[PDB]
Design an enzyme around this catalytic site. Structure first.
Site, PDB file in Angstrom:
ATOM      1  N   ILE A  14       0.835  -1.183   0.000  1.00 52.22           N
ATOM      2  CA  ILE A  14       0.000   0.000   0.000  1.00 52.22           C
ATOM      3  C   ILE A  14       0.882   1.251   0.000  1.00 52.22           C
ATOM      4  CG2 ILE A  14      -1.905  -1.262   1.002  1.00 52.22           C
ATOM      5  CD1 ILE A  14      -1.363  -0.169   3.690  1.00 52.22           C
ATOM      6  N   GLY A  15       2.106   1.080  -0.494  1.00 50.22           N
ATOM      7  CA  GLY A  15       3.126   2.134  -0.472  1.00 50.22           C
ATOM      8  C   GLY A  15       4.554   1.602  -0.511  1.00 50.22           C
ATOM      9  N   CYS A  16       5.475   2.461  -0.931  1.00 53.10           N
ATOM     10  CA  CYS A  16       6.904   2.210  -0.775  1.00 53.10           C
ATOM     11  C   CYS A  16       7.709   3.496  -0.940  1.00 53.10           C
ATOM     12  CB  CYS A  16       7.397   1.115  -1.736  1.00 53.10           C
ATOM     13  SG  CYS A  16       7.039   1.448  -3.441  1.00 53.10           S
ATOM     14  N   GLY A  17       9.002   3.400  -0.678  1.00 54.75           N
ATOM     15  CA  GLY A  17       9.883   4.539  -0.758  1.00 54.75           C
ATOM     16  C   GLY A  17      11.284   4.075  -0.435  1.00 54.75           C
ATOM     17  N   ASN A  18      12.169   5.038  -0.175  1.00 58.54           N
ATOM     18  CA  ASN A  18      13.510   4.724   0.309  1.00 58.54           C
ATOM     19  C   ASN A  18      13.457   3.913   1.604  1.00 58.54           C
ATOM     20  OD1 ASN A  18      14.344   6.195  -1.889  1.00 58.54           O
ATOM     21  ND2 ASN A  18      15.711   7.561  -0.740  1.00 58.54           N
ATOM     22  N   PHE A  19      12.383   4.099   2.378  1.00 57.05           N
ATOM     23  CA  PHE A  19      12.181   3.387   3.645  1.00 57.05           C
ATOM     24  C   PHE A  19      11.994   1.871   3.515  1.00 57.05           C
ATOM     25  CE2 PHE A  19       7.808   2.019   3.760  1.00 57.05           C
ATOM     26  CZ  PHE A  19       7.142   2.836   2.837  1.00 57.05           C
ATOM     27  N   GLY A  20      11.589   1.425   2.325  1.00 57.85           N
ATOM     28  CA  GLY A  20      11.231   0.036   2.066  1.00 57.85           C
ATOM     29  C   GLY A  20       9.809  -0.012   1.522  1.00 57.85           C
ATOM     30  N   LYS A  37       5.283  -1.827   8.120  1.00 58.54           N
ATOM     31  CA  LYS A  37       6.387  -1.147   7.513  1.00 58.54           C
ATOM     32  C   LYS A  37       7.590  -2.111   7.473  1.00 58.54           C
ATOM     33  CE  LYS A  37       8.243   3.481   7.650  1.00 58.54           C
ATOM     34  NZ  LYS A  37       9.031   4.390   8.504  1.00 58.54           N
ATOM     35  N   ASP A 127      11.248  15.685  10.406  1.00 58.95           N
ATOM     36  CA  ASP A 127      10.751  15.283   9.106  1.00 58.95           C
ATOM     37  C   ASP A 127       9.331  15.788   8.864  1.00 58.95           C
ATOM     38  OD1 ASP A 127      10.472  12.147   7.278  1.00 58.95           O
ATOM     39  OD2 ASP A 127      11.192  14.138   6.624  1.00 58.95           O
TER      40      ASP A 127
HETATM   41  N1  LIG Z   1       0.401   3.603   9.501  1.00 60.59           N
HETATM   42  C1  LIG Z   1      -0.011   3.935   8.257  1.00 60.59           C
HETATM   43  N2  LIG Z   1      -1.277   3.830   7.926  1.00 60.59           N
HETATM   44  C2  LIG Z   1      -1.322   4.220   6.669  1.00 60.59           C
HETATM   45  N3  LIG Z   1      -2.460   4.271   6.028  1.00 60.59           N
HETATM   46  C3  LIG Z   1      -2.645   4.346   4.710  1.00 60.59           C
HETATM   47  C4  LIG Z   1      -1.687   3.996   3.785  1.00 60.59           C
HETATM   48  C5  LIG Z   1      -2.010   4.058   2.431  1.00 60.59           C
HETATM   49  C6  LIG Z   1      -3.271   4.491   2.024  1.00 60.59           C
HETATM   50  S1  LIG Z   1      -3.631   4.527   0.292  1.00 60.59           S
HETATM   51  N4  LIG Z   1      -3.022   3.049  -0.288  1.00 60.59           N
HETATM   52  O1  LIG Z   1      -2.983   5.727  -0.357  1.00 60.59           O
HETATM   53  O2  LIG Z   1      -5.124   4.500   0.122  1.00 60.59           O
HETATM   54  C7  LIG Z   1      -4.236   4.835   2.960  1.00 60.59           C
HETATM   55  C8  LIG Z   1      -3.913   4.761   4.297  1.00 60.59           C
HETATM   56  N5  LIG Z   1      -0.107   4.570   6.237  1.00 60.59           N
HETATM   57  N6  LIG Z   1       0.669   4.386   7.172  1.00 60.59           N
HETATM   58  C9  LIG Z   1       1.982   4.702   7.072  1.00 60.59           C
HETATM   59  S2  LIG Z   1       3.077   4.192   8.277  1.00 60.59           S
HETATM   60  N7  LIG Z   1       2.395   5.435   6.053  1.00 60.59           N
HETATM   61  C10 LIG Z   1       3.664   5.856   5.830  1.00 60.59           C
HETATM   62  C11 LIG Z   1       3.877   7.218   6.013  1.00 60.59           C
HETATM   63  F1  LIG Z   1       2.846   7.974   6.457  1.00 60.59           F
HETATM   64  C12 LIG Z   1       5.134   7.779   5.771  1.00 60.59           C
HETATM   65  C13 LIG Z   1       6.192   6.963   5.364  1.00 60.59           C
HETATM   66  C14 LIG Z   1       5.997   5.592   5.164  1.00 60.59           C
HETATM   67  C15 LIG Z   1       4.731   5.040   5.401  1.00 60.59           C
HETATM   68  F2  LIG Z   1       4.593   3.715   5.230  1.00 60.59           F
END
Ligand SMILES: Nc1nc(Nc2ccc(S(N)(=O)=O)cc2)nn1C(=S)Nc1c(F)cccc1F
Length: 298
Positions: A14-20, A37, A127
């Site tokens: 549901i996401g990625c970046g330099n962090f993993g 994460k 940050d």
């Molecule tokens: N704890 C957490 N909950 C969420 N919620 C989230 C993530 C993606 C989406 S989406 N896939 O854009 O609808 C919606 C809600 N993201 N999230 C985190 S830790 N996000 C995040 C962040 F906020 C900054 C850096 C790395 C990350 F992985």
């Protein structure tokens, strides 16, 4: 079939970046979705384990995500934490990249308190960016709460050995996002509490204006790019940066003039914004600009 700890199933990216990577997870034991994460074990510059320690140091705070687990997961280190909602940056896009003053003020009041909380736990954040501020989960009891997330770049500004404020120094490689970072951060100074507050001010102005007047500066090196941006920050009077927003100008002038070691007056800063909020006839009802829009969900 990947699992983190006894009970957390790792689901979709549901996401990625330099962090993993960010994965949707499920606590199988509680039938609850979580965020997972993942940092490659092979990482040069691990920062997930630090970040977990910071969260444990923050403890349970208002708008601090709950962290459930840190542990290994195949070739990753994993941190299972609270699934939150969209970021302020994603919400900003949803709202055509400008927030109302009411929204920015509801955001700002909360975020001054968040930052104050982080600071009370002897941490500076370092940050500030709209991507690190998330609403709670659509439908949840905390959807209205702006959370602060991602403590990978945080630092204890009170040295646990001495219980003294960390010393002033310079020649610090730059921490945070260029767009929001404090002028002093640009100058390679050790960041302290002031810098988090200044970064917030920058971000507030971003929300209000739609942009900051040092976005899209290009240079051949990242060092030169940061330098130009900071130069533009220094060259842009608060008076014009915060034109039409007198309290933002006051906030920004105040945070910028804070001494390195100085405890910010968070009460004062909150009151600048709460007095403004009240003069404008705003009701703190969490009716942000994005309410009634289709929020993105994993
Ligand atoms: N704890 C957490 N909950 C969420 N919620 C989230 C993530 C993606 C989406 S989406 N896939 O854009 O609808 C919606 C809600 N993201 N999230 C985190 S830790 N996000 C995040 C962040 F906020 C900054 C850096 C790395 C990350 F992985």
């Amino acid at each position: 079939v990947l699992m983190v700890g006894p009970n957390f199933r790792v689901g979709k990216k549901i996401g990625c970046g330099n962090f993993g990577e960010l994965r949707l997870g499920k606590n199988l034991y509680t039938n609850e979705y979580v965020a997972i994460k993942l940092e490659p074990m092979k990482s040069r510059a691990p920062q997930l384990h630090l970040e977990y320690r910071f969260y444990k140091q923050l403890g349970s705070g208002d708008g601090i995500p709950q962290v459930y687990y840190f542990g290994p997961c195949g070739k990753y280190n994993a941190m299972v934490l609270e699934l939150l909602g969209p970021s302020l940056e994603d919400l900003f896009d949803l709202c055509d990249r400008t927030f109302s003053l009411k929204t920015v003020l509801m955001i700002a009041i909360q975020l001054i308190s968040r930052m104050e909380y982080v600071h009370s736990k002897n941490l500076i954040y370092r940050d500030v960016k709209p991507e690190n501020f998330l609403i709670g989960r659509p439908g949840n009891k905390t959807q209205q709460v702006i959370h602060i997330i991602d403590f990978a770049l945080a630092k204890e500004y009170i040295d646990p050995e001495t219980k003294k404020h960390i010393p002033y120094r310079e020649h610090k490689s730059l921490t945070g996002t260029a767009r929001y970072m404090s002028i002093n951060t640009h100058l390679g100074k050790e960041q302290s509490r002031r810098d988090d507050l200044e970064a917030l001010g920058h971000m507030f102005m971003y929300f209000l204006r739609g942009s900051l007047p040092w976005q899209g500066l290009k240079a051949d090196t990242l060092k030169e790019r940061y330098q130009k941006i900071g130069d533009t920050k220094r060259a842009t009077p608060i008076e014009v940066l915060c034109e039409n927003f007198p309290e933002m100008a006051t906030y920004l002038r105040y945070v910028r003039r804070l001494d390195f070691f100085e405890k910010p007056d968070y009460d004062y800063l909150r009151k600048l914004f709460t007095d403004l909020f009240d003069r404008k006839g705003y009701m703190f009802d969490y009716e942000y600009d994005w309410i009634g829009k289709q929020l993105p969900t994993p």
